[PDB]
Amino acid sequence: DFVLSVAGGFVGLGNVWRFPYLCYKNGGGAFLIPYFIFLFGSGLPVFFLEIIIGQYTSEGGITCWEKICPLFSGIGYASVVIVSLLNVYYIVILAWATYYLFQSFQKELPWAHCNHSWNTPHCMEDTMRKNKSTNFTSPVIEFWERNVLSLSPGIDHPGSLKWDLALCLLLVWLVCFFCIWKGVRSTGKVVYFTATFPFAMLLVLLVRGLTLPGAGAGIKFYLYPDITRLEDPQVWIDAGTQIFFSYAICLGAMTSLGSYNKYKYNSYRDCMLLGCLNSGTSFVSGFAIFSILGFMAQEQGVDIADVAESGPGLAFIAYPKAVTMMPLPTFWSILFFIMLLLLGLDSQFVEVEGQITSLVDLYPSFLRKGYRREIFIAFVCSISYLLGLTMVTEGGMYVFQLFDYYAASGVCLLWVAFFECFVIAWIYGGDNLYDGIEDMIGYRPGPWMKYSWAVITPVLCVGCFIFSLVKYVPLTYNKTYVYPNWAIGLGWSLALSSMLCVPLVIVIRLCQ
Amino acid sequence: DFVLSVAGGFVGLGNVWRFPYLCYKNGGGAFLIPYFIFLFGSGLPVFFLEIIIGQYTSEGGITCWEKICPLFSGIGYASVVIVSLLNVYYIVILAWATYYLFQSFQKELPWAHCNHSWNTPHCMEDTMRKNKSTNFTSPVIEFWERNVLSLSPGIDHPGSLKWDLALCLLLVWLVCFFCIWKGVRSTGKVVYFTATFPFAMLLVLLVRGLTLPGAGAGIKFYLYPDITRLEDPQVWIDAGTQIFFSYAICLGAMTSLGSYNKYKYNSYRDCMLLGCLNSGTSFVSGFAIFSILGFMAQEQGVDIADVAESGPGLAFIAYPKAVTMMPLPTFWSILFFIMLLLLGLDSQFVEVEGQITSLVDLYPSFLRKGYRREIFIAFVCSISYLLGLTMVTEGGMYVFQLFDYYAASGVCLLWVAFFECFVIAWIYGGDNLYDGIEDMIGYRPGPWMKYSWAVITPVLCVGCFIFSLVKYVPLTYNKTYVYPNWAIGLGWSLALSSMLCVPLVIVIRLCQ
């Protein structure tokens, strides 16, 4: 059962969706070096740490933190907050994918050309800019902004709700609802179809994506860094949080994976073999999308920095462009739109039940297996559905960025990641942990992650935090929109809701 | 130990060397369909067959054929002949790789430009043909033909021996000699370095290879087929033999792999997981090289059919071109030249000892473990070294093609593959085989390979044989050179040496 969730909750759309966006927004290749140092310094170390603690305790995420130390036990509650706030917009990511999929059930793709009612008259076809109001946009960009989101001018103007997204969001929630209620495994039928279908097509996208004439500009922008961007701290926090995002760590779902693994079982190899591949697929997917970005870069005459839209949903623009350029677009458009669900639902299936199994034992005597649990699954889905309706609003894209940058990223993941390595290294003792691991996997793991949990990762988490404090640059959308002061406070309160889980519990735990 | 040889003898240079050549010589995409039908019809079926029989008998290749049936026991002897005739030129393939590697230990690669003594004055630089004796050649083409082979005008003119290749061939034989004598495993130190280094760089070659502006022509030529080429039978036999070559089947080395696997062990999954990947890596490598071929195709102004040299050694032309175009050519040239040994030596290490373990028990009372075996390893290497000196001669490239097309390919592999599936399906009985397999791997394998061994594979082997008989087109080099009648007879006698192993043994076995 553990292997199934590895292909499920462990694998996330952020590898193919957020990773190219996070790299794109933070310059180009200047993202890669912080990505790699954060990976090799904390990511794989803390990944093996949380897997091994879940295996050693053979219990849940919340209970393991208490067992290691009665103090600092709020990491589990923070993880529950993070997974809920992650689900509430991951589900609307899948809703956007499904709405796109339904729109692709046509002879001609809607974003192939912009001659429809919704498209702005200033829209202009992609190919003819060079064959022949200087600001000219692209049909695919417009489709995502208006037909899909109908983005409002500002967050202070919500606007009318888009019923088309709501029904699509209704479908994905029900799909997640029935499988969990019926006890359906994350991978339907044969795991191979849920596994080889993603890997094959990312290669398919990679093959033509690299074949595109503009791939040379994209790869150079993807790989070559800028030292100037390294000074500005937001590239560091984004690179780190991508590590805590793609590997779905500091969520507590992977802790259940450890309990699933046998107490006497070598999980060390499984951590790094899957961890390196997860970065490899993310890196490989970077080549395809950035080549597509490079392909559109030379051919609109616009720089690579502003050729794309610097908002979440980049994977909803680049690859849909590629499939239109790829022969027989309708067949390829559906398949890529299918797997986006196949990459997301399994992630959703594992992670959503992650807190469900975390909450059933958290509040016993009322969540018994049977009548009480079925309403709870409906209860948790319904309350999250209503919270998910904020993004269905025309102005909900601005709300969407708030969760993405604050609820399950930014300082939120750095703070919890610090306290995860802090408790083991100093309070529990890294040597005490390794003493079990020698008896668990059969041999001593390398001291390198012990030092990583000791100084490297604590400095990596702490260093970016103060760098953000002194060099506080407010978050922006599409590098052109500034949120109001109250909007930032709403996003921070979400982080502070995850922040105060730990500091309050010690105050809570000391009183009795 | 079985897994080590999977990364060793099972993986061959023919995936990255012979597969792109065989596809290139037989048109373009017209090679793929016969490749795939032969794969799914015989390749994986007969692969699982030979693995499962090696596992069931837990013995050697020669002994297993006798155990299944006293008649038709010459398949083992034929396999020994095939592995010896394969080694004798696989080793000089590695010798060419090493000579190239030693020539690459310089600031400027010798084939980057042709301004040296050996290069013909009619040679001309690659880049300037379009910036500005119509037949103009390429510096990389000349380098392989003269500096590396000094190819003679005809096979009837051997010419002086090239001492530079002989010492390089001496090095590789010694390298294979010491490891086998010292009992060194196929993969040195950590298997990961011998495994991740090949896979990483083929992606590296793929990344820029697809990035090359001419990749569009190459992929279209790689994928789009021609029905006209399908009529001419040589595309069929080459596609089939590539299956029997890349998977190293009908050699008897993989039979030792079956004996290594536990009697009660599910080897069925290991066969298809590794088999599909072997085709996948071959197919993926096809994209990189043909894009390189497409890259040079548009940029010399010559058609894709004749842009390259239609002789064995294509992987010694395309990729060495790519590394020169790839920035910092010296660093990349060495690494690709290292792995060609790393892909070949492990293949050599497993296969050469394959007959050694096959011959030690074949002739007991004289090949005892100790003094008798050490001279035999020297004896087998020395006699093969002298036979390998034929290719070191300036005219040995024409000899080289004779082994490649006859000794370990062509009708040679079809004839043995037919008799492998013939004995199990009719004499032994496919149902009798599956009865064990149900008790071996725990469940019944799919009837599909049973029918494959019954009618599909026998028709596939038989059909191409008569098609070659009636439509007999003599072998040619670079689609421009015709061998003399005696040269063809010498090549056929080599096949007939492998052919007559079976028909004689029944005549031999019936007398006593």
Ligand SMILES: CC(C)CCC[C@@H](C)[C@H]1CC[C@H]2[C@@H]3CC=C4C[C@@H](O)CC[C@]4(C)[C@H]3CC[C@]12C
């Ligand atoms: C997945 C791992 C192996 C990383 C991928 C390859 C690594 C080693 C990188 C490092 C340097 C890179 C090259 C740097 C510059 C260029 C020139 C550009 O016009 C095409 C891409 C190309 C040729 C890059 C290809 C990928 C490359 C070779």
Ligand SMILES: CC(C)CCC[C@@H](C)[C@H]1CC[C@H]2[C@@H]3CC=C4C[C@@H](O)CC[C@]4(C)[C@H]3CC[C@]12C
């Ligand atoms: C490894 C497996 C998945 C096969 C690889 C991909 C398969 C499905 C093939 C089938 C059709 C192929 C496409 C057919 C035509 C073209 C147009 C050409 O100008 C660039 C390559 C491109 C875009 C090909 C890319 C690879 C492709 C998509």
